[PDB]
Design a binder for this molecule. Structure first.
Ligand SMILES: C[C@@H](Oc1cc(C(=O)O)ccc1-c1nn(C(=O)c2c(Cl)cccc2C(F)(F)F)c2ccc(Cl)cc12)c1ccccc1
Ligand SMILES: C[C@@H](Oc1cc(C(=O)O)ccc1-c1nn(C(=O)c2c(Cl)cccc2C(F)(F)F)c2ccc(Cl)cc12)c1ccccc1
Lengths: 259, 258
């Protein structure tokens, strides 16, 4: 019934708000000016990290230091997504191996999605919106690091034209997690039953929240196409970096072994 | 914190412990105490049964066994690292401090969780498919025999507390989040997390062992015995390393011991 779907939408929105540091609503206010430190070149990076816990010297080259800052922030997001997943109705009741599998194969798609909340066409928010690193600075990093950053902005600009808000994104993120086609799942049926409920709720939410945005539901599901592919391209970009170039303390490499 | 937050944290950490560590104490105790047909381990107690064990479960035997321990210890480090990431606040810390905490914490945790696999007569191996007797390990030559036995000496005492996995999940989280590790940059955010974990441990032990008086203090005192056993272990491993050439250390362990 509608009430159950709206109750589920509100449940997920409230947990979404508690799980993530910077919401899209707050991020947009920063990006539009409605005041962060701007990193637009090398000198302003040095000042920005002398006046950001991901790009502090622990690798001396700047492009490497920014690249690992991306990894180290992605590890934080994984734990934030993991906590959020526990709030999705039915999730903690799934087989424990399947919970791990769902999170393992989903965090990459979800981090891409949620990164778009922090991006516009000119750059990206960092350190809870306290900093803003320009697209041009990231795109102009040397060797493959510059071509590693730009595809994220390319996706975000297109994803952002849907103009989803946080209440829409809370259900969408839950739909991605509850994907019954992840390899190695042991009991697909209850995962698909939950996702079917989340899809009903997302569908009703987009009708109520975007009544004049025709077939928005379909277009969001199509962005599942854009997401599986770029995560595919993303892993193959990492592999080229790993064989060509990065040394970290073996313990450090263990913390990041998944990203 | 309020009780409900203390209990919610204990449940979180237990869930994650189960996801992170393939062989729980609950399963280890089922194997060790037996009474079953399907879970029965093959028992390695001498040279011939080790050979038969490696057919259903080359260097000198003591080196082979040491490499056995070394290989599991690296896997354990990997499992502990994964578990640490799930502790609320740990990944948000300064990354040098994350390294520093794992660096000094893993050995104390390995000893703790090794006890789960031990009784006074031996230790489970190959994910519980095998059991290697204490006497066999202790009779290995040169320095390798006395290198094995102190682990059993601690475990017999630690196991007298009768902790279960839900207790141990919080206890090993307290160990990791120790503010007195050398070289830490930001002691205060680590201590705030530990105080939360210590509160959680205290309530967990009172609810789970309500007839066990001062179990909390006794467990914290065991975090003393661990500081010493880890000291003796590394001082034995260094001496072993500069007398035995037939051992390389895994690069992960080599960097931890530096
Ligand atoms: C702005 C900040 O980055 C993020 C912040 C957040 C957040 O706050 O929610 C989420 C993601 C990134 C970020 N990940 N990422 C990756 O490569 C990546 C991705 Cl998409 C998915 C999974 C794993 C990874 C990997 F493991 F490989 F890291 C980026 C690539 C380019 C850009 Cl511009 C941002 C990201 C940051 C910190 C430090 C320097 C620069 C930018
Ligand atoms: C039962 C199995 O050993 C462990 C299994 C596990 C596990 O499954 O969680 C964790 C630890 C050991 C184990 N490490 N270890 C060491 O010396 C050691 C330690 Cl504690 C910490 C860091 C580095 C090392 C070193 F590098 F030096 F190796 C042992 C010494 C004696 C005993 Cl009886 C067990 C261990 C095993 C496998 C194969 C043959 C015999 C025993």
């Amino acid at each position: 019934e509608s009430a159950d779907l709206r109750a589920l939408a509100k449940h997920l929105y409230d947990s979404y708000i508690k799980s993530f540091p910077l919401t899209k609503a707050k991020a947009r206010a920063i990006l539009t000016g409605k005041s962060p430190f701007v990193i637009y070149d090398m000198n302003s990076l040095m000042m920005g990290e002398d006046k950001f816990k991901h790009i502090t010297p622990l690798s001396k080259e700047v492009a490497i230091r920014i690249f690992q800052g991306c990894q180290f922030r992605s590890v934080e997001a994984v734990q934030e997504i993991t906590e959020y997943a526990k709030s999705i109705p039915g999730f903690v009741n799934l087989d424990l191996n399947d919970q791990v599998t769902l999170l393992k194969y989903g965090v990459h798609e979800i981090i891409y999605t949620m990164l778009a909340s922090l991006m516009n066409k000119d750059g990206v928010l960092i350190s809870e919106g306290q900093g803003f690193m320009t697209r041009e600075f990231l795109k102009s990093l040397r060797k493959p690091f510059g071509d590693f950053m730009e595809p994220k902005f390319e996706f975000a600009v297109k994803f952002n034209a849907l103009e989803l808000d946080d209440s829409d994104l809370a259900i969408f993120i839950a739909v991605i997690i509850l994907s019954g086609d992840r390899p190695g799942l042991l009991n697909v049926k209850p995962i698909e039953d939950i996702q079917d409920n989340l899809l009903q709720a997302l569908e009703l939410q987009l009708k109520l929240n975007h009544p004049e945005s025709s077939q928005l539901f379909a277009k969001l599901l199509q962005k599942m196409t854009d997401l599986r592919q770029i995560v595919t391209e993303h892993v193959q970009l990492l592999q080229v970096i790993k064989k060509t170039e990065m040394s970290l303390h073996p313990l450090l490499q263990e913390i990041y072994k998944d990203l």
